[PDB]
């Protein structure tokens, strides 16, 4: 049974036992034990072929000495290091043999003194198998085990004259003080003997697939029994650097069970150091919780926190005796920042809210945009949406009032048409011209059917900032022939365009009569522009179907733009829930639901729950003076959000003939009835616990100076109780 | 997008558990030395400890705090088959003095935690024998009185528990407990309003490996439910509600980057990111992508 051992004085020394012993020294990074570790062999020796037992010295001088006990019973003490000045050169290679032939299973060393040699061999004919020699610095130290087989033994660490004697089917408490004094207890587990170093009186055993541990003071029955294993155990050992930790290795087992015995249930942990079952592993006595396992392919495998969150988007971490903090190099942080700019508090200029959002987001920029037109439209059916409003040329004659009144209002809401019946896009035209989005203006004029005006616009744009001129040269080809080479070619070739407005315009110019199917199903263009084109071009049934399908798609997706067509309604509520699911931003949604919702809409359970969630979040952020701002807006917009009366002065004896408008207050520090003619300094405080009160300034000064209930013969701190 | 900054905190023994607070002014740390210490981050941010007490003869099993809405309350779990609730008393150094005890269960407590703050004072504990019991204090003003409202028999060794995290009126009572005793480990139990009894809803049949931690991320009033389970592999699953009410089940994600069992599952205040630390000595924090795709956006060592 090969096993891996380490030097008792050096931690960088690693050994693998076989028919040819290999000694290696660990160096930082030859065998690569780990990714950053390399082990270089010190020497190779095979002085003990077909060996059965081995041990190690109990003294630094000499070092690099390990037992070589072959099956013949001979005990050979060989040292592998560069021996030049050994403390006991006489013992180097000392040939010790037993009188009767036998095979030694396990060899252990006495810790307190190294001048003795104790080992157990096979059962003798009729004689004592357990004969221990004296190492010192031709006769043995002590012998026992008459006609008995000792599977294993070891000298106890607490007492130099203490060791364990195990019979064939029993364990005998052998005392070196008096060999005639021994106590034997019958047991089946006489193998895998392991003992905790911290718990010197605790012993353990490994017996095939069953492991039993018994206490020395109660060595009559096993204290507990380990789980039965199918594979036989390969090695049982106790980790010395970890309290209440034991390691059990099974033959042909790739996962090593590690039970936690520090409870007195035992917490068993399975460790797999490699994909191949390691024959044995060695725990580090100097390093903390370090174990090196030896794979059967001459591979040395070596194997060896608290986390939390924070309300300001921080993570706290811990490890052993160390702690760590994590911070961003976030939805919550973005919401907090949006709060930090006083976003959503605008009343005079709702247009400014999108800018107040700060970040570049078209959806939010669309979101506040839609209300801004809606805000002007108010100055209630407008909040219903495009759906409710919509519920109620074979050629292109390029060169307005014919639009329906509902269509006119829809276009006005979309931002294209200003107030009044003046159907003139010159306002939006000049606004776009100053805005710089020349392509959008060109598309709009094309929708407004001003071809040469669009030509002038594109030429002026080219006068600003090349490609635009050639695009316009293509634009000059507005031909409506059904057998068209120009339309046969450019209609396909337009796909190479980068800006999608030009491609949309080319498609519209080159599309068939009426069938503007690609017009609606364009997804990379602005929503309001598409809606306006559909309203100003499509047929009534066609427009209704297009609006319905677009609304369904927007509700299914959850895009902030869709609020404009959906409006503030139950469908608006569903869209808000969809957006919350998509992102989860509350503050934006919270104000959005507060954008003039009706009483029925404000009665939505989803809306109230979302507002309450935002309120709780705003409370947790500690932004003291800001939560009241949301409360104020809630009370202003809605009269159901009114606060309760809360405090109500009516108690004690009432009384009459003495009233303000006997007495209820008295100034404990001035004894003046309250209410007499820094305004906050003239109020009167009251004590929830101290059942007292007095002038606010007087109480403030006294509590600043004095630190007790100024209420006479009282002890309850009327203010130093919350400890803010 | 997280930068790790070590905190100048030294633990004499191995950390047994950690606790925090809604305001987060102070933090509670449990050590293997059978002692409980509380460290508070100062105004400058320096975390200093001013409390030190030994809870139970055994080592600490778990520890948690309560709502800042109800004064200062701390609860602890130990392997000594007992639960202690130390309360700081300031006279001005504070003095953590136990207000009551919870040692009804003959076995060691796997974990002890409190319920949502909406419905009142209620903290429960998970027993390793598949037992969980919740005690409700009749009066807040009295801190020494606490009577068990009910009990739950998991019939399988409980490892971690997690109750209903949503304060919604429609969100009825719900409790989820994991098992580390092949079978399902996470059982969602619900206290029916009409029956006034805690009844199971469903068992997470999709998981058969032993469960280490069971937690549900911050609700923020979503339209569904999100929770995490700690086992040999980290997975993300979603619960959408339709006796017990039916629900829709779908796994949001399952990332096993740690390549080992995770000791515990953690998250963020807004539920934006859930944090998991595997047995590999690494912490994996996953963030959903803009296409509703969870991605491990944090790596720790
Ligand atoms: Zn009166
Ligand atoms: Zn008072
Ligand atoms: Zn006064
Ligand atoms: Zn007083």
From Swiss-Prot, chain A:
Superkingdom per UniProt: Eukaryota
InterPro entries tied to this protein: MIOS/Sea4, MIOS_a-sol, WD40/YVTN_repeat-like_dom_sf, WD40_repeat_dom_sf, WD40_rpt, Zn_ribbon_mio
Spans of repeat WD: 46-88, 99-137, 145-184, 186-224, 228-264, 336-378
Keyword Repeat: yes
GO CC field: cell junction; cytoplasm; cytosol; GATOR2 complex; lysosomal membrane; nucleoplasm
Gene3D superfamilies for this protein: YVTN repeat-like/Quinoprotein amine dehydrogenase
BP GO terms, sorted: cellular response to amino acid starvation; cellular response to nutrient levels; central nervous system myelin formation; negative regulation of TORC1 signaling; oligodendrocyte differentiation; oligodendrocyte progenitor proliferation; positive regulation of TORC1 signaling; protein-containing complex localization
Residues given in the record as Zn(2+) 3 binding sites: 687, 690, 718
Family as reported in the entry's similarity comment: Belongs to the WD repeat mio family.
Physiological role: As a component of the GATOR2 complex, functions as an activator of the amino acid-sensing branch of the mTORC1 signaling pathway. The GATOR2 complex indirectly activates mTORC1 through the inhibition of the GATOR1 subcomplex. GATOR2 probably acts as an E3 ubiquitin-protein ligase toward GATOR1. In the presence of abundant amino acids, the GATOR2 complex mediates ubiquitination of the NPRL2 core component of the GATOR1 complex, leading to GATOR1 inactivation. In the absence of amino acids, GATOR2 is inhibited, activating the GATOR1 complex.
Protein name as annotated: GATOR2 complex protein MIOS
Protein's organism: Homo sapiens (Human)
Taxonomic path: Eukaryota, Metazoa, Chordata, Craniata, Vertebrata
From Swiss-Prot, chain B:
Biological-process GO terms, alphabetical: attachment of mitotic spindle microtubules to kinetochore; cell division; cellular response to amino acid starvation; cellular response to nutrient levels; defense response to Gram-positive bacterium; mitotic metaphase chromosome alignment; mRNA transport; negative regulation of TORC1 signaling
Domain of life: Eukaryota
Activation and inhibition: The GATOR2 complex is negatively regulated by the upstream amino acid sensors CASTOR1 and SESN2, which sequester the GATOR2 complex in absence of amino acids. In the presence of abundant amino acids, GATOR2 is released from CASTOR1 and SESN2 and activated.
Keyword Hydrolase: no
Modified residues (Phosphoserine): 172
Record keyword Oxidoreductase present: no
Signal peptide residue numbers: none
Keyword tags: Cell cycle, Cell division, Centromere, Chromosome, Chromosome partition, Isopeptide bond, Kinetochore, Lysosome, Membrane, Mitosis, mRNA transport, Nuclear pore complex, Nucleus, Phosphoprotein, Protein transport, Repeat, Translocation, Transport, Ubl conjugation, WD repeat
Family annotation (InterPro entries): G-protein_beta_WD-40_rep, Sec13/Seh1_fam, WD40/YVTN_repeat-like_dom_sf, WD40_repeat_dom_sf, WD40_rpt
Subcellular location: Chromosome, Centromere, Kinetochore; Nucleus, Nuclear pore complex; Lysosome membrane
GO cellular component, as recorded: cytosol; GATOR2 complex; kinetochore; lysosomal membrane; nuclear envelope; nuclear pore; nuclear pore outer ring; Seh1-associated complex
Glycyl lysine isopeptide (Lys-Gly) (interchain with G-Cter in SUMO2), cross-linked positions: 12
An example Gene Ontology molecular-function term: structural molecule activity
Subunit structure: Component of the Nup107-160 subcomplex of the nuclear pore complex (NPC). The Nup107-160 subcomplex includes NUP160, NUP133, NUP107, NUP98, NUP85, NUP43, NUP37, SEH1 and SEC13. The SEH1 subunit appears to be only weakly associated with the Nup107-160 subcomplex. Component of the GATOR2 subcomplex, composed of MIOS, SEC13, SEH1L, WDR24 and WDR59. The GATOR2 complex interacts with CASTOR1 and CASTOR2; the interaction is negatively regulated by arginine. The GATOR2 complex interacts with SESN1, SESN2 and SESN3; the interaction is negatively regulated by amino acids.
Similarity remark: Belongs to the WD repeat SEC13 family.
Protein name per its UniProtKB record: Nucleoporin SEH1
